[PDB]
Design a protein around this ligand. Structure first.
Ligand SMILES: N[C@@H](Cc1cc(I)c(Oc2ccc(O)c(I)c2)c(I)c1)C(=O)O
Length: 267
């Protein structure tokens, strides 16, 4: 019927496929890679400081879509963006299927997912009571502030994602696997090792579907619902890439930290 008598008893309430031992090892590695690079781990809610409320209310630099930029808010956010980008690279480097790619492939994949991953890490720290996001576990920001400091409607999409993810009760492994599925994408141009990257994505997706089955979440249809959030995050990444091109047409390079320009000054 099954396996041994013990195995069937332990699996008695399981229906759905659980992770294999090899998937559990993949899951453990990705979870630890995320927790060792996710800032302020559990400490974030006490240790975050609100962005002063008089910053972000003065958008005066024009943009093509008519959502203007407040340069002082954009400066406060870019001031802390280089350590946050650096943690996404630290995370990817800790995944063996990423670190074994050619160096050129690893840079293309990191450029392709960086905003998706930093937006997910802000959105999972949405706080319903203050209606804020937390940036790098330290800066609490209101919708108006993040919208006027350069993101424009991107910030609304991240807040909407953050508010919707509260009911999903994601744990650190789910966040780490959504990050690995975002990272291991072949939807980018100029990759060499396409088949290998697709195979990794498929291994991460299936470990992730089996870990979701293991967790027995209390909202129904959890796995497709979570896939639809991955799609929302890729839309957020595309919106940000379009918006960042416009930033650079409008504003001088001196305002953009070198690593921020490198990861996104892109297509
Ligand atoms: N909160 C994340 C890091 C994180 C840091 C920052 I600054 C963010 O804001 C952005 C992002 C792109 C931009 O062009 C602008 I202007 C502001 C976001 I959204 C996320 C972490 O915990 O790693």
């Amino acid at each position: 019927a099954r396996g041994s008598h013990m195995e069937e008893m332990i699996r008695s309430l399981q229906q759905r496929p659980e992770p294999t031992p090899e998937e559990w090892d993949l899951i453990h590695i990705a979870t630890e890679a995320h927790r060792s690079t996710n800032a302020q781990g559990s400490h974030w809610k006490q240790r975050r400081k609100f962005l002063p409320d008089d910053i972000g209310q003065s958008p005066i630099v024009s943009m093509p879509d008519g959502d203007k930029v407040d340069l002082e808010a954009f400066s406060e956010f870019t001031k802390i963006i280089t350590p946050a980008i650096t943690r996404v690279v630290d995370f990817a480097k800790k995944l063996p299927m990423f670190s074994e790619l050619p160096c050129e492939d690893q840079i293309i994949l990191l450029k392709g997912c960086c905003m998706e991953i930093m937006s997910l890490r802000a959105a999972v720290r949405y706080d319903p009571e203050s209606d804020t996001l937390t940036l790098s576990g330290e800066m609490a920001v209101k919708r108006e502030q993040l919208k006027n400091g350069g993101l424009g409607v991107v910030s609304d999409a991240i807040f909407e994602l953050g508010k919707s993810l509260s009911a999903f009760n994601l744990d650190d492994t789910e966040v780490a696997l959504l990050q690995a599925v975002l990272l291991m994408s072949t939807d980018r141009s100029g990759l060499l090792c396409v088949d290998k990257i697709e195979k990794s994505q498929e291994a991460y997706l299936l470990a992730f579907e089996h870990y979701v089955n293991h967790r027995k979440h209390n909202i129904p249809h959890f796995w497709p619902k979570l896939l639809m959030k991955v799609t929302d995050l890729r839309m957020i990444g595309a919106c940000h890439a379009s918006r960042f091109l416009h930033c650079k047409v409008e504003c001088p390079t001196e305002l953009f930290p070198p690593l921020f320009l490198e990861v996104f000054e892109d297509q």
